[PDB]
A paper describes a structure:
Spackle, along with another T4 gene product Imm, confers the infected host E. coli with resistance against secondary phage infections—a phenomenon known as “superinfection exclusion”. Our results show that T4 Spackle forms a stoichiometric complex with the lysozyme domain of gp5 and potently inhibits its enzymatic activity, whereas Spackle does not appreciably inhibit the cytoplasmic T4 lysozyme (endolysin, gpe) responsible for cell lysis at the final step of the phage lytic cycle. Crystal structure of the Spackle–gp5 complex shows that the binding of Spackle induces an allosteric conformational change in the gp5 lysozyme active site and partially blocks its oligosaccharide-binding cleft.
To that end, we co-crystallized Spackle and gp5 lysozyme and determined the crystal structure of the complex by molecular replacement phasing. Two crystal forms were obtained, in monoclinic and orthorhombic lattice systems, for which the structures were refined to 1.78 and 1.92 Å resolution, respectively. The monoclinic crystal contained two Spackle–gp5 lysozyme complexes in the asymmetric unit, whereas the orthorhombic crystal contained one complex in the asymmetric unit. In addition, we observed several 4-(2-hydroxyethyl)-1-piperazineethanesulfonic acid (HEPES) molecules bound on the lysozyme surface, including one occupying the oligosaccharide-binding cleft (C-site)20 and another in the peptide-binding groove in the monoclinic crystal structure. The protein structures of the three crystallographically independent complexes were essentially identical to each other, with pairwise backbone room mean square deviations within 0.5 Å. Spackle engages a highly positively charged horseshoe-shaped surface around the deep substrate-binding cleft, spanning both the N and C-terminal lobes of lysozyme. Although Spackle binds over and partially blocks a distal site (E/F-site)21 in the substrate-binding cleft of lysozyme, it does not block the enzyme active site or interact directly with the catalytic residues (Glu184 and Asp193). Superposition of Spackle and gp5 lysozyme structures in the complex with their respective unbound state structures shows conformational changes for both proteins upon binding. The conformational change displaces the lysozyme catalytic residues (Glu184 and Asp193), both of which are in the N-terminal lobe, with respect to the oligosaccharide-binding sites.
Residue numbers in the entry:
A (entry chain A): 175 to 341
B (entry chain C): 23 to 98
Write the structure that this text describes.
């Protein structure tokens, strides 16, 4: 499942932390605000609307059930966007569920708009040229900067299965 | 790996304390198993983040922490 896959790649927090860009984050890679804000009154105010009840704490905390609910909504939002995207969508519709997961994993990390920048990789996937698609994914700055995750994800694109995640 | 105390602590404690523990645990395995990979691992932790490894290291009985090097830098 995407839950198991992204729990592995994103980790699991019940208290706010800040990502590599300085953005407040919680749960399974749930971005609270795309701003380098540390003020906990403001972070908790936004997170309260996202979770649906008043968040408290410095930093704010959620329960495990809330983290799962945020993830399910984040996953659904990303899946909505990837399927309707004029460049990524056609590729997602043309590959098997495992390779769909790889694309969804990337979109969860970088946004569907980030995935759309992988022109060579996407073109190769539409052609079934998996070695070319794999090499294009591994030639990227994304691979340079999150190499372990990019390795596991591009291995899916190459092999068409999830064994790089132990499945 | 699964560690009852570190699992929940890593989910809830202040980020700075948790990242110090994660980074120390990773770097200890690197030094034992693939010491030449220290600079590559440090580079990946800076560019890619540290916090995300809390789940596989402390919350997942099915993940063997000897594999955390490949988790950070990729297979082989
Ligand atoms: Cl070990």
């Amino acid at each position: 499942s995407m839950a198991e896959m992204l729990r592995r790649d994103e980790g699991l927090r019940l208290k706010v932390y800040w990502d590599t860009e300085g953005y407040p984050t919680i749960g399974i890679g749930h971005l609270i605000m795309k701003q380098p804000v540390r003020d906990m009154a403001q972070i908790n105010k936004v997170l309260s609307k996202q979770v649906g009840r008043e968040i408290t704490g410095n930093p704010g905390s959620i329960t495990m059930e809330e983290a799962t609910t945020l993830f399910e909504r984040d996953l659904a939002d990303m899946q909505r966007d990837i399927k309707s995207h004029s460049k990524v969508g056609p590729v997602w519709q043309a590959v098997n569920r495992s390779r769909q997961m790889a694309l969804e994993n990337m979109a969860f990390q970088m946004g569907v708009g980030g995935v759309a920048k992988f022109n060579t990789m996407l073109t190769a996937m539409l052609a079934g040229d998996w070695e070319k698609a794999y090499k294009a994914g591994r030639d990227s700055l994304w691979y340079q900067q999150t190499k372990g995750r990019a390795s596991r994800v591009t291995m899916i694109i190459l092999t068409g299965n999830l064994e790089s995640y132990g499945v | 790996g699964y560690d009852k105390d570190l699992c929940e602590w890593s989910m809830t404690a202040d980020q700075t304390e948790v990242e110090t523990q994660i980074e120390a645990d990773i770097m200890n395995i690197v030094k034992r198993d693939r010491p030449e990979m220290k600079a590559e691992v440090q580079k990946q932790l800076k560019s890619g983040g540290v916090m995300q490894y809390n789940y596989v290291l402390y919350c997942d009985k099915n993940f063997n922490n000897k594999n955390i090097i490949a988790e950070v830098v990729g297979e082989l």
